Each structure stands twice: as structure tokens, then as C-alpha cells.
Symmetry: D3
Subunit: 145 residues, 6 copies
């Protein structure tokens, strides 16, 4: 079952047409993996070295290979809660991406950004909503969050 899930997952990446973690979860559920969830999908994206790429249809999508990869291609997910916008990236890319985001600053609604190895926390200024900040970050990275 696990070998089949890995094969199915990699095939979705090879199609170069899925743009978000939720899309991958839904595709796998439709294939029969009833217990699939975002936690499992996030672990697989990290484990198998998935990155994003702009396909020939101009869509930012996951793919399976990274010296020529761009920072934007290193973003794997953008999500949020009431207080923070959280980005997940490929291993060790969070710091580099956070450097760029914290340069955008308060005028763009970013009060501050802190990154871990593959996770970034973006906190908003009092003048922008977490949802608007979320929408702006999704636009910057072309992620269908």
C-alpha cells in the first residue's frame, strides 16, 4: 500500500499540473487512498525532493527533479491562521526566502518574518488583515492557497 502511494504520488508530480497540497490530497483520495491528508502529502513533498516549476501552460505546479531552481520554485505551500501567514519550503530554503520577504517590509503589510529550516512565519502589521496578507503572499509566489 505504501509503495503504491509513493508511486501514485510521484506520478502526480510527473504530470506537472497540480498547484497546491490540497489538489494532491484530493487527487490521491479519488485514486482510492481514503486516509491521505495534508500531513502525509507535506512529508512526501519533502522526502521526494519536490519543487515547483512554471509549466508550458504558464501554471506554477509541482514537479519531480537542484542548482538551477529559483526561490519561488522552492515554495511548497502557503497557508494561514488568524495571526500568521505560514510558508513551507523545500529543505533549507526558508532562510533565503525569508530574507526577501522581510525586505518588503511594513509598507507591504509585513511587520516581520522569521524562518526555521523549511518553515517561514510572516506576521502582519496592524494595517493589513492576515487574509489580505495571505492573498498577497499567494500572488507573489503564484500559489493557489
Amino acid at each position: 500500500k505504501q509503495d503504491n502511494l509513493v508511486r501514485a504520488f510521484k506520478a502526480l508530480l510527473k504530470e506537472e499540473r497540480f498547484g497546491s497540497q490540497g489538489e494532491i490530497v484530493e487527487a490521491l483520495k479519488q485514486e482510492g487512498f481514503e486516509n491521505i491528508n495534508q500531513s502525509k502529502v507535506s512529508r512526501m513533498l519533502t522526502k521526494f525532493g519536490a519543487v515547483r516549476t512554471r509549466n508550458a501552460k504558464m501554471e506554477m505546479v509541482y514537479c519531480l527533479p537542484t542548482v538551477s531552481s529559483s526561490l519561488r520554485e522552492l515554495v511548497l505551500d502557503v497557508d494561514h491562521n488568524q495571526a500568521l501567514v505560514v510558508i513551507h519550503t523545500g529543505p533549507g530554503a526558508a532562510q533565503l526566502i525569508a530574507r526577501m520577504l522581510d525586505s518588503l517590509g511594513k509598507s507591504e503589510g509585513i511587520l516581520g518574518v522569521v524562518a526555521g529550516d523549511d518553515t517561514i512565519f510572516i506576521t502582519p502589521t496592524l494595517t493589513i488583515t492576515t487574509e489580505q496578507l495571505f492573498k498577497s503572499v499567494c500572488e507573489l509566489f503564484e500559489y493557489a492557497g
Copy 2:
């Protein structure tokens, strides 16, 4: 007075029976250290190299010694506020523990995790309360928070 506090503190660790920072504070107050607080206790746990261990009564407790220590044994405190679950660890162990926590993912209520040297911030998904996340994290680390 400070020499006596250190001696008293180390003795509490040697008893291998205290399970939380608050328990240590209370024990020291009862001994006569009226001005003791969690800030002082946290500094002492860090300074004296305290770690936790499962005692022979099956209780996770502080002890005074660490190549054979486990990640769980490296957690010193778990607490929270309205927006985050915060974990304090032994020096330089936060990154390693955060790697594990962020692998649990959204399906377990963890939207993201970021760590500093000995501090970890865990932010919840919109589908779990900070208190429930707190309770789950306390269960994972067997910490009486």
C-alpha cells in the same frame, strides 16, 4: 543566599521527582526562597544542564547529569498563550525537536513550527484550539504543563 539557592535547586533535580517548572518554583518557595519565580528556574535549568528522564516510577522528571539523551528528554517546559504553544529545551536542541513537530503537520493541528536555539514556537491550524494543541504537545512530551 545564591549559593544556597543553587544547592537547593540541584537537590530538587537529584530527587528525580519534579515534572514541571511550576513544581520546582513551588518546592523552592516552600523551602523559604520567597522571591523564586519561573524566570529564575528556567535560567537555572539551562545553566546547570538539567534534562528530563523517565524515573523508575514511570514519571518524566528533571534530573542532573549528554550523548545518550533523547529528544523528549531535552524538553524543559511546554506552555502557551492565546496564539502559540511554546516549548523550551536544553541548549541547541530546539531545531531538532522542531524538525519532528513540523513533520506531524496540519492534520495533527500544527500549521507550522519555527525554532530558535532553545525555544520553539508552534502555531495551530484554524481547526484546533491553542489549548487542545497545548494538551496534545504536553501528552507527546509527557510534560505536566
Copy 3:
């Protein structure tokens, strides 16, 4: 225009009389730079290696030069939102300053602190307001936030 902005900005630093990012923004607007904002000012403080110093009038102010610099002199801004107190520092100084802040602990209203390269997130305990924590942090660093 950009060359003039840089010259104007550096001159403000050389005056050794401005104590906050907002003061710099206002001074530049008054000089005719209508589009100046905190994002631009934050980038310039980082780019030109600005630090703070206590001037001869006993005021903590920005200056243009750092082996003899103190941690307090490495703080560039202190601001906050509803959930966090955020500090911006000179490049690579956040970790060191965060070490000090997280030692203050819960008894001082600091539940935890995590730092990125030049940004620090301070989360409050349930017993202190974000504004009171903000005011205390501003006092510690003598920053007119």
C-alpha cells in the same frame, strides 16, 4: 533621485539625532521625498550599516559607522501588532539579542523568543498585554517606538 535619497539618508544618520524609523521617514518627507516609507527606510538602515549610539545629549540615535558595538546599539526598530513584539536588528545580531531576551523569561512577561537573521519575535505571557510588553522592550532598548 535615488542618489539624492541616499545622500539625504546618510546625512540624517550623521546628524546623530534621530531615534526611530518613523522620525527618519518624516524627515525625508519634509525634504521632498514624498514616496518615502518605513519599508524603504528599513532597507537603507540595513544596506548602509546603520547602528545606534548614545549621543552626547544622552539620546539613543542612529549613526553611520563594528567590533565595539553593543547589543543595544544593534537594535534598529521595535514595533508590534496584537500578538507579537517584533524587533529588527543589524545583520546577524538577532540571535544574540534574542538569547538575552529569552533569559528575562515569563516573570517579565516573555513567554518565548525566536529570532531569524535580523528579526526577533517576542510572544507575551497571558499576564501581560502586547502593548505593555512593547513598552517594556522599548524601555530596555531606549527606542522611541
Copy 4:
């Protein structure tokens, strides 16, 4: 072929009897994977989340699962060149292990230690050879280097 290599590799881990990267390479070559090398084995140990464990025969060996893991169990390889002893660990464990090693100090032949995410560089004092330091580090971690 790659699916077969992964299956073969995981099976070696499940046997809980291999103690070093070189042993894994040799076992895979004997099975028919003529092009296997340490670079590939190191990538697989990282990718599949391998850790070490003391088996029932008292041997430190690789296994396939980590909250209960010890620092020693997080070491994947110990090797050296003329100037440094280099340790590879599981993801994000290098910092924690380095903290311990740099505490051993000059009296134990360790002039200094610096760690990356999963790599540690140990430089020797002028009073110990890189090979003796290597042998001591291998003994500490019970690694057949």
C-alpha cells in the same frame, strides 16, 4: 532499477546488522548494484529517515523507523581527511551533537567544532592527530569508521 535499489536498501536497514556506510555499499554491490557508492548511500540514509540503534547483539546499527531517539543514534557517518573529522547526522541533528562535542574541549583534542544542518566539522588541537581524533570520535559514537 531505482525501485529495486530502494527496496534492497530498506531491507538492509530492517536487518538491523549494518554498522557503517561502507558496509551498506558493499552489501548492495554484492546484490548486483554495480554503480552503488557512498554518495548514493548517504542520500538514501537521509531520504528514508534512517537512524542507528543498539541491536540485541549490542551492535550499533542502522535501522528504519523519532521523538525517543538519542543523539548517538542520530549519527550516520564519521570520516576524516588530513585536517578534519567530519560527522554526518540525520536532518537537523548536527547542531545539538556539536554542542556536546565542543564541550569536550581542547583537553580531549578538540580545538573547535562547527555544524551545518546535518554535517559537523571537528578540528583538532596541535597535540592530537586527525587519525587519533577520528578514532576517539568513532569510539564515542560506536561507529565502525
Copy 5:
């Protein structure tokens, strides 16, 4: 004089034709800046946010702008001594690039890699010379070292 040096330096970047730090130093000396050296050039590349790009003549060269930048474009210099290959990168990009290099492994002559914020140390295996490793790293990043 400093304002003229900055203007001259930025103009060299805008030409999009210089491939190494030494080339920049030589060009500036020829323009009349007799005291220019690599230390000053390295500081300027960092300060002004220089990155590399493949120009229309297929040459990897410095340019003056970075969300769409690749890891290779983030390398600013490759040099070496008798024991290490050292890479300098744009701010906060060293960790990400090191992750990639340490994946190449021992079979490619890389015993280990450790990174700081914008500096990477690559130590060779006993089977490759520091100069051959240097030459291979220069080829990977297309840097005329």
C-alpha cells in the same frame, strides 16, 4: 571618492560582462582606483545586492537587480586554499547552496560542507585534491575562479 567608486562599481555590474571578483578589481584599478582590492569588492557585491545572471552571450556575469533568482545565480565567488574550497554567496543563500553540495557527497570528492550566512566551507575527501575540487566547483557554478 567613495561616491565615485560606488558609481563606477555599479556601472561595471550594469555592463553584465564581468565574471569574477578579480575581474572587477582589475577594471576598477584601470579606471584609477589604485587602492581597490577583493575585500572592498566583496563588501560592495554584498552591500549593493549583486547577483549573477547568464547574459545573452552565454556568460555567467554579475548584474545589478530577487524572488526569481536561482541558487547558481546566488554564488558571488569561489576560491580556495590548501585545505578548503570556499564559496561566498548573496546574503542568506549559503545554507541552501550547501544543502545541494553536501548531497553530491564523497563519491564526488566532497567529504563535507558547512555553511555560515553567506560563506560555505567545502572540505575534500583524501581522494581528490583541493585544486581539482576547486576546479569542479567552479565548473558547477560556471565561475571563472
Copy 6:
């Protein structure tokens, strides 16, 4: 015995007259602690929060207290071997100090610098000896290495 060693050690710090780890080791040996060594002294400097200060006799010496501390005051030891100059600092100060050192660059004999939490590795260019680099670093930090 350990309580006496701690008391003796702290008293040496309070004298504000010792300038190097070796001086502390020698003073403790003279007091009767026959088994004292640099490993133990380094651990104590870290554990007890020692920093350096310029005393009234203009000597850089250890002291026992740090928001007003300078980067230079955060250096605890400077030593070297055949290939590297290694600096030990107070907890979490290595990154900040390394940022400054790597800005000095190749023209000052510094090929590169990488830091861990409280340790810094400085590798020399082919044009400066490790001993000359050592002597220059000792002069910069006024450390009697």
C-alpha cells in the same frame, strides 16, 4: 571539591585581571586544583556567563556580570592549529562576530569564516600564515593567545 572550584573560579573572574584561558588554568593549578585544564575552564566560562571587559588598567580581562556588552567583550578565547584560527565566544555570539570578520576579507588574509553557536572557524588565504592570521586576530580582539 566542585563547589570550591566554582567559588575559586568566580573569584578569579571578580579580580578582573586574567586575560586568557591559560592564565585561569595556571591560577587554579597554583591554588591546588591539580586536575584543572582548558576544557574545564572553557565549560565554566560558558556556564557562569563570563564576558570580557577593559579594566581600569586598560587590560582586556574576564569578568563576572548582558545588553550593554560589545562584540569584542563577547570573545572568550582565540587559538589555532595548522589550518584554522578558532574563536570561542559567549553563547550565541559567534554568528554576529563572524559577520564582522568575514567583511575584513581576503585582503586582510581571511579567505572565509563560518560560525556555529559559540565557535568561529577562520580559514586563511594562501598569502598569510595561520600564525600571522592568529596574531592579527588576537590583536583585533586584544586577546593574549
